PDB file of C-alpha atoms (C1' of nucleotides) and ligand atoms in Angstrom:
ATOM      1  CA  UNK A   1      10.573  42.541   1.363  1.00 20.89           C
ATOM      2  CA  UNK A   2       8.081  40.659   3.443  1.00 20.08           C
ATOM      3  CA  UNK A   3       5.411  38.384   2.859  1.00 20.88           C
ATOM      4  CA  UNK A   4       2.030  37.229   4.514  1.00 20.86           C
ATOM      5  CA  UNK A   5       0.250  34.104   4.278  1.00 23.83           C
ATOM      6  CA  UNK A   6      -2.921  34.189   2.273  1.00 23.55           C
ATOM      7  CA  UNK A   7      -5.073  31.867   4.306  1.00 24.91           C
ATOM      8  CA  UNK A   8      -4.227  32.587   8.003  1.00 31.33           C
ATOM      9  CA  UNK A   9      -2.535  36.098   7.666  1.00 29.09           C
ATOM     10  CA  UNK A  10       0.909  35.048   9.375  1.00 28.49           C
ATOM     11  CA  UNK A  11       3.713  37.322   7.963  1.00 22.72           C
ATOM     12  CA  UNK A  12       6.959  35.861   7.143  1.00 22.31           C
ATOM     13  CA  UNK A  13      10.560  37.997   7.054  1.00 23.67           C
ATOM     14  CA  UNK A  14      12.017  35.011   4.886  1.00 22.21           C
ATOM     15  CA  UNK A  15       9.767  34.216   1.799  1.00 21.92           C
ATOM     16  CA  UNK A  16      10.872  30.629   1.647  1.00 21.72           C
ATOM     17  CA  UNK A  17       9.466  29.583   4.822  1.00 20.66           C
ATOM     18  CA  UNK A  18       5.856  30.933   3.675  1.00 15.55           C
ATOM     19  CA  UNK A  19       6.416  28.805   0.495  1.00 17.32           C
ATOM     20  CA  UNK A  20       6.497  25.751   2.346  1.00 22.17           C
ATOM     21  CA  UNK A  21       4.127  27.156   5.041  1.00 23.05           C
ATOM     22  CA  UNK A  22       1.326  27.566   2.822  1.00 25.92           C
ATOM     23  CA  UNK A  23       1.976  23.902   1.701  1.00 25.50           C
ATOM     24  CA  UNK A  24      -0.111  23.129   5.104  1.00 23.36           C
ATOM     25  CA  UNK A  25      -2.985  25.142   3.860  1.00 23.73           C
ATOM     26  CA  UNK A  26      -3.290  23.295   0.334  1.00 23.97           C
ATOM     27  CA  UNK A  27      -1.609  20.389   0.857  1.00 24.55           C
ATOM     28  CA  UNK A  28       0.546  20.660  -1.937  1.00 24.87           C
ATOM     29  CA  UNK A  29       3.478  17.692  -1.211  1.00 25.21           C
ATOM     30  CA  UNK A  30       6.027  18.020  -4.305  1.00 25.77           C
ATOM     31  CA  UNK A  31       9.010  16.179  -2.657  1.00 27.11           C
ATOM     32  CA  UNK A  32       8.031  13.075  -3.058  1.00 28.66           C
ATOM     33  CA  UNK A  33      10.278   9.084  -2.165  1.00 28.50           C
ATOM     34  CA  UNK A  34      11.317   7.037  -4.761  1.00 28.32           C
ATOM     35  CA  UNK A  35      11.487   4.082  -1.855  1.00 26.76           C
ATOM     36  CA  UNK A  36       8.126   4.539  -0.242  1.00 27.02           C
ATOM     37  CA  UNK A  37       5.327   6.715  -0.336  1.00 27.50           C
ATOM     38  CA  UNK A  38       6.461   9.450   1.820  1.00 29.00           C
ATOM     39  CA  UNK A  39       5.685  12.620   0.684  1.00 32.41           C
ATOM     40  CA  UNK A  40       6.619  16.180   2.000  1.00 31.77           C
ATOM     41  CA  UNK A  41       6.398  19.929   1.813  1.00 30.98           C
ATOM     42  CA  UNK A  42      10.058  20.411   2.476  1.00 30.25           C
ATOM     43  CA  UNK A  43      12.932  19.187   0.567  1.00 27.75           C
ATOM     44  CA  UNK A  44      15.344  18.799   3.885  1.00 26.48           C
ATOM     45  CA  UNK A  45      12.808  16.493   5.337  1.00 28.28           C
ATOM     46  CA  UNK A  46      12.644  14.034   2.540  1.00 30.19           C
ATOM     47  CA  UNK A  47      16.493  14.249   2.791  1.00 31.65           C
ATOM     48  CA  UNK A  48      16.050  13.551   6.589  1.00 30.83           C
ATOM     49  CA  UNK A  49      13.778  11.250   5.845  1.00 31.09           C
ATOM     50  CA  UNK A  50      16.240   8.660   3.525  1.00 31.77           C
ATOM     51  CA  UNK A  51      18.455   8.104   6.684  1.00 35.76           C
ATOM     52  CA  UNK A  52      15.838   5.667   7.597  1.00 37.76           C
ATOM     53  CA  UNK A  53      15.880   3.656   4.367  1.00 40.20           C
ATOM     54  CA  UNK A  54      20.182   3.369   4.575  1.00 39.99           C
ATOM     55  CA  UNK A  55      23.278  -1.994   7.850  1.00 42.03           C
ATOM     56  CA  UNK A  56      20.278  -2.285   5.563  1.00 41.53           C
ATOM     57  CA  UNK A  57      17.198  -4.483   6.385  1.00 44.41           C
ATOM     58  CA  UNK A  58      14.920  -5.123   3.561  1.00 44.13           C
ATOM     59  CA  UNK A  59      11.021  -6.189   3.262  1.00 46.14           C
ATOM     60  CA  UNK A  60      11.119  -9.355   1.209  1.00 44.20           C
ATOM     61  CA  UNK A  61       7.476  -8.928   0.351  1.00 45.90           C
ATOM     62  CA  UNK A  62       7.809  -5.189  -1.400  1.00 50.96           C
ATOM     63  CA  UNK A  63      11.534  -4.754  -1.388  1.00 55.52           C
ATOM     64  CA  UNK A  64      11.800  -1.893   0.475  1.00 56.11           C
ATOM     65  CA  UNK A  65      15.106  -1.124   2.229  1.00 55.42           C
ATOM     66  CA  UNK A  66      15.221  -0.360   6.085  1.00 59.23           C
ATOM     67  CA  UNK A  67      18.231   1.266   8.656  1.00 60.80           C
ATOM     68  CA  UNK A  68      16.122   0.295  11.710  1.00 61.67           C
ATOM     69  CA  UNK A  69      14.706  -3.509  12.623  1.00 62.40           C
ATOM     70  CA  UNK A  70      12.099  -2.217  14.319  1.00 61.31           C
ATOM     71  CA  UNK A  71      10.724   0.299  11.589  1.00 59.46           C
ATOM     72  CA  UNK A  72      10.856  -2.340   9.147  1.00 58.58           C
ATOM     73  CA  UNK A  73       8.447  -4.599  11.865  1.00 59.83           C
ATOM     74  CA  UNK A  74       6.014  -2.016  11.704  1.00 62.53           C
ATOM     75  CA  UNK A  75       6.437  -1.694   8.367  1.00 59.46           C
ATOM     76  CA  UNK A  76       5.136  -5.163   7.858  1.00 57.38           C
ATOM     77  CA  UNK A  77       1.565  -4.916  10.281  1.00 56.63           C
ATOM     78  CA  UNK A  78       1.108  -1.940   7.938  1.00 57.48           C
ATOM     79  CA  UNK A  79       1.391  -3.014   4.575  1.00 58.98           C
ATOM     80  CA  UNK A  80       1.542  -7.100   4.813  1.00 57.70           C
ATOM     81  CA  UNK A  81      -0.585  -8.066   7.957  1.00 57.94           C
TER      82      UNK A  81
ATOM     83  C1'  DA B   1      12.438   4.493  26.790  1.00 61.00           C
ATOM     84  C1'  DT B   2      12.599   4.314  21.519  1.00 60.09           C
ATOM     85  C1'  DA B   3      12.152   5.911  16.110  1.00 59.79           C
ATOM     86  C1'  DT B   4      10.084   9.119  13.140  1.00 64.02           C
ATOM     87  C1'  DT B   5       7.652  13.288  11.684  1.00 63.70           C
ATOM     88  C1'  DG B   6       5.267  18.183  10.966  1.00 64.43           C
ATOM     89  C1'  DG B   7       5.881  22.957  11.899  1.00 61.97           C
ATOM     90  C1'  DT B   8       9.103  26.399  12.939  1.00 59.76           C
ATOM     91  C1'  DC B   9      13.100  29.203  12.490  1.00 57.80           C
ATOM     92  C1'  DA B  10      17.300  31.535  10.719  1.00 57.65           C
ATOM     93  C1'  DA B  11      22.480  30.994  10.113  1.00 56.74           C
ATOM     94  C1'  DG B  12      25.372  31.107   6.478  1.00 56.35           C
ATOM     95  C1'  DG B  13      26.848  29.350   2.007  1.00 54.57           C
TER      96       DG B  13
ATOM     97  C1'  DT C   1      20.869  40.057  -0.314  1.00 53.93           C
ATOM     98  C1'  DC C   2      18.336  35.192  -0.235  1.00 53.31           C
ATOM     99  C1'  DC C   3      17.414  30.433  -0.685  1.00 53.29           C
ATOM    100  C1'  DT C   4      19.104  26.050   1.073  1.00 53.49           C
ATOM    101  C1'  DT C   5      19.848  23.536   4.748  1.00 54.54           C
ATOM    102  C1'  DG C   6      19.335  21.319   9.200  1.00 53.57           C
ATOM    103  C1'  DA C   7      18.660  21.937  14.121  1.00 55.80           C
ATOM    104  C1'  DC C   8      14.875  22.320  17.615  1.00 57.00           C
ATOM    105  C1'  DC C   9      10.619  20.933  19.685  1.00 57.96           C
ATOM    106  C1'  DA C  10       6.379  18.768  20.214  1.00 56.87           C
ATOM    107  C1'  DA C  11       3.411  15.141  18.432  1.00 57.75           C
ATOM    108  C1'  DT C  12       2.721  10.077  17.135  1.00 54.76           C
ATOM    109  C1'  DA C  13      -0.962   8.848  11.281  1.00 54.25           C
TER     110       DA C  13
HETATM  111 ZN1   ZN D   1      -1.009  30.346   6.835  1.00 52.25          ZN
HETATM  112 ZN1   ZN D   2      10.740   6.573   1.859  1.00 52.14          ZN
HETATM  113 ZN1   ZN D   3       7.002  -4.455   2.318  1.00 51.66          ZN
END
DNA sequence: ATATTGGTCAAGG
DNA sequence: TCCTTGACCAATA
């Protein structure tokens, strides 16, 4: 059948897309990053979200692995300024 | 301009 | 039938 979201009242024809909806109302993050501490409410964006941890640039301070120069840079002001 | 992300949506495995 | 997957778009901690 269909569902509706309990806090805002927006109806969903797929039921998996109000499961990870209503993860914006409680901010329930269960896919979490073993490299960082990302954290999501939806499994394809923690899978989109390795392609930026691996060619491979990596913080010599934390060890954290890095596709991009640049986001390792900023990387660095954040956690080692 | 870039890299990355949250919310959205539904095709198709 | 239905959940997984990933493309799209707008926003940027
Ligand atoms: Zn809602
Ligand atoms: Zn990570
Ligand atoms: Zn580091």
């Amino acid at each position: 059948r269909s569902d509706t979201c309990e806090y805002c009242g927006k109806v969903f024809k797929n039921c998996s897309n109000l499961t990870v909806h209503r993860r914006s109302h409680t901010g329930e993050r269960p896919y979490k990053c073993e490299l960082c501490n990302y954290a999501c409410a939806q499994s394809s964006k923690l899978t989109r979200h390795m392609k930026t941890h691996g060619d491979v640039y990596k913080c010599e301070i934390c060890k954290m692995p890095f596709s991009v120069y640049s986001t390792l840079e900023k990387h660095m002001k954040k956690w080692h300024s």
